[PDB]
Write a protein that binds this ligand. Structure first.
Ligand SMILES: O=C(O)[C@H]1CCCN(c2ccc([N+](=O)[O-])c3nonc23)C1
Length: 129
């Protein structure tokens, strides 16, 4: 359901989200005008999510319910746990007593990414490439 190549088509509140996470202005400026592709693949237990953009490429590979070390696009060193809850991929990142949740869900033709940090929610919609 998640496997594919996905292109960003809309975004709400992403600058506020990155500011709440603690991302500096210059990174927010280039990350916000980026229009990434998200490439999701699976082989057995291992899910890979790639983000490709002219700002930064990133990749995570993980097993559901197995905490892993992640370096984010903004260079945060986080402890990440991804689970699959009612069709939703729920990704929690924990660092310095803080946390952020990124939910990836399939709604109609879209892949919806909901990013929560404290009182800020950002919603990013992707469509198949
Ligand atoms: O995949 C998506 O659409 C977004 C999900 C939430 C995490 N994403 C982010 C991207 C980039 C930067 N950055 O600062 O360059 C972030 N900083 O915080 N979060 C960031 C991508």
């Amino acid at each position: 359901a998640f496997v594919g190549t996905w292109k960003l088509v809309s975004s709400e509140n992403f600058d506020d989200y990155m500011k709440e996470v603690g991302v500096g202005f210059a990174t927010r400026k280039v990350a916000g005008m980026a229009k990434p592709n998200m490439i999701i693949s699976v082989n057995g237990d291992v899910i890979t999510i790639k983000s490709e953009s002219t700002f930064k490429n990133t990749e995570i590979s993980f097993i559901l319910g197995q905490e892993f070390d992640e370096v984010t696009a903004d260079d945060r060193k986080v402890k990440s746990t991804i689970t699959l809850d009612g069709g939703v991929l729920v990704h929690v990142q924990k660092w310095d007593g803080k946390s952020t949740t990124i939910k990836r869900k399939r709604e109609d033709d879209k892949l919806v990414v909901e990013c929560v940090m404290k009182g800020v929610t950002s919603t990013r919609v992707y469509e198949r490439a």
